[PDB]
Amino acid sequence: PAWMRTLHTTASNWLHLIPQTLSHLKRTVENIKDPLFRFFEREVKMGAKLLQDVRQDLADVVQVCEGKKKQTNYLRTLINELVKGILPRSWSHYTVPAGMTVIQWVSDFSERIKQLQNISLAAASGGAKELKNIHVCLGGLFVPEAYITATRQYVAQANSWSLEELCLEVNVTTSQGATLDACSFGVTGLKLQGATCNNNKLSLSNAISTALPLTQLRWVKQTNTEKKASVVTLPVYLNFTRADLIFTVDFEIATKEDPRSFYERGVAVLCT
Amino acid sequence: ERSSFPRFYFVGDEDLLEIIGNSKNVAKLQKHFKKMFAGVSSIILNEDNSVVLGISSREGEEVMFKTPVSITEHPKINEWLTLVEKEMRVTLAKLLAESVTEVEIFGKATSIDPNTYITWIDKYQAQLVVLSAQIAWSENVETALSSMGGGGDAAPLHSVLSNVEVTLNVLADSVLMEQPPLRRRKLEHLITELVHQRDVTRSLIKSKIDNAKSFEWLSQMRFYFDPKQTDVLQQLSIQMANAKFNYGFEYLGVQDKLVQTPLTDRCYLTMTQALEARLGGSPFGPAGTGKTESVKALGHQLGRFVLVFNCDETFDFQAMGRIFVGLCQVGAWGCFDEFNRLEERMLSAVSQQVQCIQEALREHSITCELLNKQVKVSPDMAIFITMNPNLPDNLKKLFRSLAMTKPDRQLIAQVMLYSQGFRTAEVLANKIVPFFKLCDEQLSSQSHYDFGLRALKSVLVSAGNVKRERIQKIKREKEERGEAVDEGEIAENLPEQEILIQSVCETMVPKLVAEDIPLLFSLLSDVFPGVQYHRGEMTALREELKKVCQEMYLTYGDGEEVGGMWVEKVLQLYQITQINHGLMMVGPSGSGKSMAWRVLLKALERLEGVEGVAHIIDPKAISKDHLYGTLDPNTREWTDGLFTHVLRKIIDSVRGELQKRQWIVFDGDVDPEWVENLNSVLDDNKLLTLPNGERLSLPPNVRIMFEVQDLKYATLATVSRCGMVWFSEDVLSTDMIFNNFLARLRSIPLDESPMLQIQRDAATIMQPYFTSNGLVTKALEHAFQLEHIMDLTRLRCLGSLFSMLHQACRNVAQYNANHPDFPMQIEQLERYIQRYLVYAILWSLSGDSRLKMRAELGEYIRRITTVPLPTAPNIPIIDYEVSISGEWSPWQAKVPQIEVETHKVAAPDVVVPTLDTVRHEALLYTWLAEHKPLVLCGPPGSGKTMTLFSALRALPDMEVVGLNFSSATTPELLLKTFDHYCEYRRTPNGVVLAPVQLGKWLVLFCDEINLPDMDKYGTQRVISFIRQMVEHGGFYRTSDQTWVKLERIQFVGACNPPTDPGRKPLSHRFLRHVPVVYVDYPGPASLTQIYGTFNRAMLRLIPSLRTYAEPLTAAMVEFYTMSQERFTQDTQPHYIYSPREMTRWVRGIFEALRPLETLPVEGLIRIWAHEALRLFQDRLVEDEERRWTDENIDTVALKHFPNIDREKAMSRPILYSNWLSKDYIPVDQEELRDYVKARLKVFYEEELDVPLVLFNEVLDHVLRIDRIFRQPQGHLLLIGVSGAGKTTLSRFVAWMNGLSVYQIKVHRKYTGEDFDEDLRTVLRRSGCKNEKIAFIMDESNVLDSGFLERMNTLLANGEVPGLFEGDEYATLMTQCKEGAQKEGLMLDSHEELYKWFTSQVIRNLHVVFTMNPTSPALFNRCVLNWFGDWSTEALYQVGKEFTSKMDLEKPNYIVPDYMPVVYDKLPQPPSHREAIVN
Amino acid sequence: FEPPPGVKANMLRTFSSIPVSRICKSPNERARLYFLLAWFHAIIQERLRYAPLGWSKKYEFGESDLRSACDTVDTWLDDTAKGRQNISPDKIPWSALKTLMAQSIYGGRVDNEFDQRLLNTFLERLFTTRSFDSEFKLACKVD
Ligand SMILES: Nc1ncnc2c1ncn2[C@@H]1O[C@H](COP(=O)(O)OP(=O)(O)OP(=O)(O)O)[C@@H](O)[C@H]1O
Ligand SMILES: Nc1ncnc2c1ncn2[C@@H]1O[C@H](COP(=O)(O)OP(=O)(O)OP(=O)(O)O)[C@@H](O)[C@H]1O
Ligand SMILES: Nc1ncnc2c1ncn2[C@@H]1O[C@H](COP(=O)(O)OP(=O)(O)O)[C@@H](O)[C@H]1O
Ligand SMILES: Nc1ncnc2c1ncn2[C@@H]1O[C@H](COP(=O)(O)OP(=O)(O)O)[C@@H](O)[C@H]1O
Ligand SMILES: [Mg+2]
Structure with a gap:
């Protein structure tokens, strides 16, 4: 049948597109002590398992397409799901937008695996100290809130502080013109919608979304001071559907601006 | 009757009848x-009652x-019940009034005397003191806003808040010291409510509210009590926001206090507004x-019940309808749980019911139709439903919604830590809550892990208890050393982060897997930096654990020594027992959970002087209805x-069981089917709810534990509600098992001493091989690297x-007994024990794998051992044995050469001994001597059943x-x-099950031990049931719920590979107890021996051919070998072979050689070829396969019978028939064709007349069917496409040969019982009447696998014992x-007549299966016949024969230039008719 | 059959649904505050169309919520003004209505904290004693 050939073509295309393999992080006691290493090792393990599953999936589908394999029950529901163009249930292990089709999911998975490969290569080249200095897209990660928690743990353990007494400061600077403080972590890919941020100062704009160049998460000791009237708390959603709440940032609005207008207009920060 | 005093309507007809009959019996009314x-x-x-x-x-x-109510003055039940409730409400109101007066005396005071306050608390109930505090605070603050009503004035709210603060100070002072548990609960509730009051008062202070009518104060829940009001109902009114509630004034007793988080306050506001609008709320959320x-809490604050129904998948209606209508009449509230989990029909029904109830409630703003009855719904009714993400469409309008997305865990921890008396509660809470968030997120996910809010509450309660215990210890130490005692000073200098860490560790470390403990300590360091805990070793408990381990032959250690991990696990189990009432030891089978808790119980009994008793209940074996009550x-x-x-029995305390420590352990798997009733017990309320409506309080000394090997299918509700101890397999190291075995061998004898001495020498000999990294460990x-037919468990092997080494010791003892003059010396004993140990490792570690893996193990052990081994160049050690003299002797010597009789050729009873049979008999006797159940697993055929039965x-x-x-x-x-075979008898130990006949060990042979299907939760009831008796040596008689000890009963099983x-x-858990032996297909040598014996028995009828028995058997086994090798199962699902085919082959040769008095070797070769074609050629599909079989049978006959002529002995038309002559003799196909056409005409004349055309394929198939119908146990599997003529040919053969045909009339209603009845009728007509039966079966008739199992048993054994039982058996x-x-046979005893009936059935009944192209076992029990589809030749013959009447003769027809020749054998000139048929 | 989109159409639907007698009662400001409630409900329901932006999820802000809000309005206006023809805007129980329609009505279905914050912003912008002025701005910079 024609659909059989089309499925063969798309499976071969995706097999070509998706990277080959993912390398696990080498275990070490000093690395075990570091929390960032633990989080990134968990992410690498999950990503590698999912990548192996998807690759073996595509290989089995291609082999069925040649005709040397019989369609088992799992393969049959798999092929039905593929031809109907919806996301397979087994493939989707991390939180995903509801309406995203298979092709977009495969492209996103390829991007995530590329980021994970870069992260693993950087970790292997150096160690936890180099692992702290990696600019990581929150959308690319499977569990970004785990990354936020890992950064908090690293800051607390480095300076012998308690976790509960640390608060989050966000500094939005360009990638080139950024300073990597011991308590600062580079985060890329955050998109600001409904407003534009300049010199860490929010301004209301009619643009659909403004891309933040490089968001720096700085954990500082709780100053125990009331927040100023010109500060605004913005949600950070995982995707455009706004179904996942990763964390809340605090930004300083510009002069003459009204935070109530920021709340009404649905200004938010998106990982993707 | 129920119309008056509707409060008692809550109970059902059962309790209504009970209270009516026993109205004078007030002592039996307490359950109501x-x-x-x-x-x-x-x-x-009083005493007069x-x-x-x-x-x-x-x-x-x-x-x-x-004023007590006198029942004598009001004999009517309803009147005195109403008086009792009215007086209870009035007493609650009066007590509330005077308690409010007392607390008002307490109020508006600079300082409070702790003794007076504690006296007031002790005088009163927890609910009542909480209500009095609420009323006092509300009245004081109301007077205060009345004071500032002028505005811009001084603030007495500061004075009221300061009074609340000083009350908090004295409260935290009081709870630090030891208090009775009831006073502890009252103090905790008072602290919680007063903390909430302080919080709301500080909020009012910050908001600078100066008007009593301001909404910010109006939103807070206010209580307003009126002492002068005549009606006790109207004295106290609970107003909040615009809603006004009257107090229920029902005696709530003592219940857990819900902290008043902002989410809870919002819930109160929403629910009160909804009730004011006369419609309930629906607080959905995760x-x-x-x-x-x-x-x-909202219900309790208003003095009303809620009945939180549990809406699991298995949900009731009749009792559910009863509790609903009772609630509607009484007026007490009703709440739901997990509503969306209900079934769609169930959901619709409950939605309609509550829709009617809600519509009645709205129309009240009065009776409604409920269960075809009128129910008076009280105005104070409310109903609530909790969802997990929506409301049904008929309820979305009638019901307010609320988002219970998350609770405030930080404030919950702060308030509850302050309740326990902890200082610096804010810091501790803000540390602990994120720590539990990290544990929920960062730690590896596991089935038994749980870090919910309930776990946090348990942790905090345990922390309060541990702080109290530490304070008491410090007080005792100060009493011993010095005399200065002051609770405040010891409280001040007491570390609290250390105490919290100790509680957290004691609660969570036991449930953590091996690799998560360092992660937990890293998390603790991250959250609680620089502060650490040290485990306080239990010295006395460690000493007594050592003593009990010594008594029980278990190895014991401390720290890093052998058994240290196990001892630490036992101590963790002890701590979990101390801090919890519901435990759960989770770990793979073989980690020592059972022995861990048994040793802990014994040590505790020997420690505290409190004798412990343990009840072991297996939930899965017993039905839930019998488990909980009928x-x-x-x-x-x-x-x-x-x-x-x-x-x-525990509650009644008949023999002081309350003073005892009683442990109920649920040994067996857990699923969300029966544990849903136990969820009400594992929680804080701890009560046994019963369908009858009875409630049983859980005693303090009762502990519930579920020794479950896994938690995959267990719901999170059960996991969250009980403590967890994780028992990894690493806990019980192999050395521990070895030491336990050796200690038990050295201490206890096998018979129940010379044999004890023999055991000691044997253990001394095998000690070198059992050490760490010894021979056995490496083996x-x-x-573990090899592959086994069943999953490999260390403890099983x-x-x-160990059992087979016990048998070795028994053999040594028997040898010493049989040679009293020369007992076996030390050197011979050492040789024998070493050789037996090697052989035992060989047959135990790889006793359940193929021969190649056995050889791999043999070569490995030969490489790694120093024990002497046989010097056979290629024969493996397994085929050898260890004689009583400590020498390696081949098993072949033990194999005899018997000669079976002629009339017993291939009879079911006969079991010719062979190498496989003798080895399996030896091992079977070995494992039977210790009464250890065993399972014989092997491919279909292979003689698993006959070997077991003969042994x-x-x-x-x-x-x-x-x-x-x-x-x-x-x-x-x-x-x-x-x-049927045993009986119950009463013995001083207890009720004992034993066989009726004395001095016999009954074996319950299970032919298919893995056939029964597992439930939806992956559990087989029969398997767990058999395991329960295998391990505990007994079970519970469900008739009276009594433990029944098994005596003289043991189980033996057989099965096929699970694949x-x-x-x-x-x-x-079952495999651990049962050793498994793999009965592969007998080797060519074994087949040669057994069927050579069969052939030598067969050929004695004709003496002139006796000399040809051996070559005939050799040719048979050789051809069968290539048949099995070539026609593998991968080609077709039915391409299987076994020795059963050889047995059929020899049986057929016997049945066709018996009539013939004399016969030359050519005839024997011809008959052998005929049977080979009928067995290993017709089952094939492709013509190339058939040609291959013919060529190979030609080669085999030539090779093994060289001095013969191929034309006579192997003439191509191998067609044998009994139709023409009297004997079963070859005949030319032409006479066959003519005679069978004549018989077809007679078939038209007599039976149903449909025109049948005769093609050569029908000739061959009718010959095969006749040949099988002639044989005993002739069962045919007609495999072919529909309509080919399988059923018609079967009927034709049955009619011709005289067998009465029989078909099933199966319809959609045809359940199993009809099939058993019809099988009964067929069996009676075939065995009891000596009348042959042709059982036509088609796969369309098969409706479930059970039919196939019954038929399979009928094919195998010749009959099935299941059909005929009791009266049917007597008939x-x-x-x-x-x-x-x-x-003409006289037989009296049951068994002889049953055997005669079985022989008649096997000789007479013939069942033929027709399927359209599947258990391989079914294939092996029938001779598979390939009908296939009509070929081109066949279709052409049908066409010509049917269209012979029509005249398609056209001389004008001229042959084409090219003629279609689809017919293989078309004549060279097509005439018109052949062209048309083509 | 689906409702016509638009704030205007929603407002006419709301006003036609509510009976004549209920809106014109003893307090003449009841009609004004009912108009404010109708405008708030229309704004919320039309914001529901732009679900990713106007809200976080498609809540069920149906007519039952409007009926409950109107009932709360009537009860509180009865309680504050005991059969009085004219009532000052300051004496109007604004805080009661704001909290009731932020937590119980229109807020019970709100699970996201940010949607609750937006609802509070809308209520505090609309329901205030400053509204009873002729210069009140129901919206700012519409075009
Ligand atoms: N402390 C110990 N030292 C040595 N051997 C032990 C010890 N505890 C138990 N054993 C032995 O190891 C095995 C453990 O059996 P046990 O029934 O306790 O384990 P289990 O994992 O709880 O089993 P199951 O899940 O089948 O009930 C037994 O053979 C027992 O004799
Ligand atoms: N020792 C033996 N004595 C007699 N027959 C034997 C022996 N060993 C194997 N056979 C033959 O092997 C075949 C299988 O025997 P049996 O019917 O007992 O198998 P089974 O274990 O019941 O098979 P299944 O897997 O179907 O339960 C029979 O035809 C039998 O003649
Ligand atoms: N405000 C509170 N005060 C005290 N305990 C609380 C409070 N809220 C929740 N809990 C506890 O947290 C757990 C959550 O309650 P549960 O009924 O299991 O939630 P759900 O119904 O959402 O599954 C219970 O153990 C409960 O006692
Ligand atoms: N040898 C034959 N010649 C002509 N018709 C036949 C022959 N065998 C079967 N039939 C036809 O097949 C029909 C019965 O088919 P049946 O044997 O029940 O199918 P199945 O082979 O699936 O059991 C009869 O009506 C008969 O006409
Ligand atoms: Mg069998």
Whole structure:
């Protein structure tokens, strides 16, 4: 049948597109002590398992397409799901937008695996100290809130502080013109919608979304001071559907601006 | 009757009848008052039991009536019940009034005397002191806003808040010291409510509210009590926002206090506004957010019940409808849980019911139709439903919604830590809550892990208890050293982060897997930096653990020594026992959970002087209805269940079991089917709810533990509600098992001493091989690398090896007994023990794998051992044996050469001994001597059943009962077998099950031990049931719920590999006890021996051919070898072979050689070729395969019979028939064709007339069918496309040869029982009447696998014991007796007539299966016939024969230039008719 | 059959649904505050169309919520003004209505904290004693 050939073509295309393999992080006691290493090792393990599953999936589908394999029950529901163009249930292990089709999911998975490969290569080249200095897209990660928690743990353990007494400061600077403080972590890919941020100062704009160049998460000791009237708390959603709440940032609005207008207009920060 | 005093409507017809009949019996009315009233467990009366003096709670707190109600003055039940409730409400109101006066005296005071305050608290109930505090605070603040009503004035709210603060100070002072638990609960509730009051008052202070009518104050829940109001109902009104509620004033007793988080306050606001608008609320949200607790607290604050129904998948209606209508009449609230989990029909029905109830409630703003009855719904009714993400469409309008998305865990921890008396509660809470978030997120996900809010509450309560214990210890130390005692000073200098860390560790470390403990400590360092805890070792408990381990032959250690991990696990179990009432040891089978808790119980009994008793209940073996209790749907009598019975026995305290430490352990798998009733016990309330409506309080000394090997199918509700101890397999190291085995061998004898001395020498010999990294350890490690037909468990192999070493010691003792003059010396004993140990490792570690893996293990052990081994160049050690003289002797010597009789050729009884048979008999006797159940697993055929049956009949004192397990097998089969062959007897130890006949060891042989299907939760009831008796040595008689000890009963099983279709792998907990031996297909040598014996028996009829027995058998086994090798199962699902084919082959050769008095070797070759073609050629599909078989049979005959002529002995038309002559002789196909056309015409004349055309394929198939119908146990599997003529040919052969045809008339209603009945009728007509039966079967007739199992048993054994039981069995034996009398045989005893009936059935009945192209076992029991489809030749013959009447003769027709030649044998000139048919 | 989109159409639907007698009662400001409630409900329901932006999820802000809000309005206006023809805007229980329609009505279905914050912003912008002025701005910079 024609659909059989089309499925063969798309499976071969995706097999070509998706990277080959993912390398696990080498275990070490000093690395075990570091929390960032633990989080990134968990992410690498999950990503590698999912990548192996998807690759073996595509290989089995291609082999069925040649005709040397019989369609088992799992393969049959798999092929039905593929031809109907919806996301397979087994493939989707991390939180995903509801309406995203298979092709977009495969492209996103390829991007995530590329980021994970870069992260693993950087970790292997150096160690936890180099692992702290990696600019990581929150959308690319499977569990970004785990990354936020890992950064908090690293800051607390480095300076012998308690976790509960640390608060989050966000500094939005360009990638080139950024300073990597011991308590600062580079985060890329955050998109600001409904407003534009300049010199860490929010301004209301009619643009659909403004891309933040490089968001720096700085954990500082709780100053125990009331927040100023010109500060605004913005949600950070995982995707455009706004179904996942990763964390809340605090930004300083510009002069003459009204935070109530920021709340009404649905200004938010998106990982993707 | 129920219309008046609607409060008692809550109970059902059962309790209504009970209270009507026993109205004078007030002592039996306490169960009712438990059912309806709130805190009440019983009503206090005098010795006369005639006047209701007072009321009591289930905890022990009681109220005294100001004016007690005299039942004598009001004999009517309803009148005095109404008087009792009215007086209870009035007493609650008066007590509330005077308590409010007392607390007002307390209020507006600079300082409070702790003694007066504690006296006021002790005088009163927890609910009442909480209400008094609420009223006092509300009145004081109301007067205060009245004062500032002028505005811009001084603030007495500061004074009120300061008063609340000083009350908080004295409260935190009081709870630090030791208090009674009831006073502790009252103090905790007071602290929680006062903390909430302080918070809201500080909020009012910050908001600078100066008007009493300002909404910010109006939103807070206000209580307004009016002492002068005549009606006690109207005295206190609970107003909040615009809603006004009247107090329920029902005695709530003592219940857990819900902290007043902002989410809870918002819930109160929304729910009160909804109730004001006369429609309930629907607080949806995710799991573990306290929505149900919010409903409970809102109801309790208003003095009303809620009944939180549990809406699981298995949900009731009749009792559900009863509790609903009772609630509607009484007016007490009702709440739901997990509503969306209900079934769609269930959901719609409940939605309609609550829709009617809500519509009645709205119309009240009065009776409604409920269960075809009128129900008076009180105005104060409310109903709430909690969802997990929506409301049904008919309810979306009638019901307000609320988002219980998350609870405030930080404030919950702060308030509850302050309740325990902790100082610096804010810091501790803000540390602990994120720590539990990290544990939920960062730690590896596991089935048994749980870090919910309930776990946090348990941790904080345990922390409070540990702080109290530390304070008490410091106080005792200060009493001993010095005299200065002051609670405040010891409280001040007491570390608290250390105490919290100690509680957190004690609670969570036991449930952590091996690799998570460092992660937990890293998390603790991250959250609690620089502060650490040190585990306080239990010195006395460690000493007594050592003593009990010594007594029980268990190895014991401390820290890093052998057994240190196990000892630490036992101590962790002890701590979990201390801090929890519900435990759960989770770990793979073989980690020592059972022995861990048993040793802990024994050590505790020897420590505290409190004797411990343990009840082991297997939930899966017993039905849930019997497990919890049976409520008769019609007679309405309640029969208490097993768990219910043991709980009631504990409660009654007949023999001081309350003083005892009693542990109920649920040894067996867990699923969300029965544990849903236990969820009400594992929680804080701890009560045994019963369908009858009875409630049983859980005693403090009762502990519930579920020794579950895994938690995959367990719901998170159960996991969150009980403590967890993780028992990894690393806990029980192999050296520990070795030491336990050696200690038990050295201490206890096998018989129940010379044999004890023999055991000691044997252990001394094998000690070098059992050490760490010894021979056995390395052999086991390598054996784990191999592949086994069943999943490999370390403890299974170790137990089998230990049992077989026990048999080695028994053999040594027997040798010493049989040679009294020369007992075996030390050197010979050492040689024998070493050789037996090597052989035992060989046959135990790889006793359940193929021969190649056995050879791999043999070569490995030969490489790694120093024990002497046989020097055979290629023969493996396994085929050798260890003689009593300590020498390696081949098993071949033990194999004899018997000669079976002629009339017994290939009879079911005969079992020709061989290498496989003799080795399996030896191992079977070995594992039977220790009475260890064993399973014989192997491919279809292979003689697993005959080997087992012959070995069992060999020993005289062991009787055999065969049990054919089906796909629908249930333990009731085993109970029925026990009833038939055993009986219950009362003994001083207890009730004992033993066989009726004395001095016999009954074996319940299970033919298919893995056939029964597992439930939806992956558990087989029969398997767990058999395991329960295998391990505990008994079970519970469900008739009276009594432990029954098994005596002289043991189990033996057989099965096929689990990879085969329809086979479910056995549980590891069951496999651990049962050694498994793999009965592969007998080797070419074994087949040669057995069928050479069969041939030598067969050929004695004709003496001139006796010399050709050996070459005939050799040719047979060789051809069968290539047949098996070539026609593999991968080509077709039915391409299987076994020795059963050879048995059929020899049986057919016998049956066709018996009529012929003399016969030259050419005829024997011809008959051998005919049977080979009928067995290994017709089952094929492709013509190339058939040509291959013909060529190979030609080559085999030429090779093994060279001095013969191929034309005569192997003429191509090998067609044998009994139709023409009297004997079964070859005949030319032309006479066959003519005679069978004549018989077809007679078939038209007599039976149904449909035109049948005769093509050569029908000739061959009719010949095959006739040949099989002639043979005994002739069962045909007609495999072919529909309409080919399978059924018609079968009927034609049956009619021709005289067998009466029989077909099933199956319809959509045709259940199993009809099939068993029809099989019964067929069996009677074939065995009891000596009348042959042709059983036509088609796969369309098969409706379930059970039919296939019954037919398979019928094909294999010749009959099935299942059909004929009791009266039917007696009727069958009457028929068989009369039939034997008619035939001429006199038989009396049951067994002889049954055997004669079985012989008649196997000789007479012929069942033919027709399927359209599948258990391989079914294929092996029939001779598979390939009908296929009509070929081109066949279709052409049908066409010509049918269209011969029409005249298609056209001389004008001229042959084409090219003629289509689809017909293979078309004549060279097509005429018109052949062209048309083509 | 689906409702016509638009704030205007929603407002006419709301006003036609509510009976004549209920809106014109003893307090003449009841009609004004009912108009404010109708405008708030229309704004919320039309914001529901732009679900990713106007809200976080498609809540069920149906007519039952409007009926409950109107009932709360009537009860509180009865309680504050005991049969009085004219009532000052300051004496109007604004805080009661704001909290009731932020937590119980229109807020019970709100699970996201940010949607609750937006609802509070809308209520505090609309329901205030400053509204009873002729210069009140129901919206700012519409075009
Ligand atoms: N402390 C110990 N030292 C040595 N051997 C032990 C010890 N505890 C138990 N054993 C042995 O190891 C095995 C453990 O059996 P046990 O029934 O306790 O384990 P289990 O994992 O709880 O089993 P199951 O899940 O089948 O009930 C037994 O053979 C027992 O004799
Ligand atoms: N020792 C033996 N004595 C007699 N027959 C034997 C022996 N060993 C194997 N056979 C032959 O092997 C075949 C299989 O024997 P049996 O019917 O007992 O198998 P089974 O274990 O019941 O098979 P299944 O897997 O179907 O349960 C029979 O035809 C039998 O003649
Ligand atoms: N405000 C509160 N005060 C005290 N305990 C609470 C409170 N809220 C929740 N809990 C506790 O947290 C857990 C959550 O309640 P539960 O009924 O299991 O939630 P859900 O119904 O959402 O599954 C329970 O153990 C409950 O007692
Ligand atoms: N040898 C034959 N010649 C002509 N017709 C036949 C022959 N065998 C079967 N039939 C036809 O097949 C029909 C019965 O088919 P049946 O044997 O029940 O199918 P199946 O082979 O699936 O059991 C009869 O009506 C008969 O006409
Ligand atoms: Mg069998």
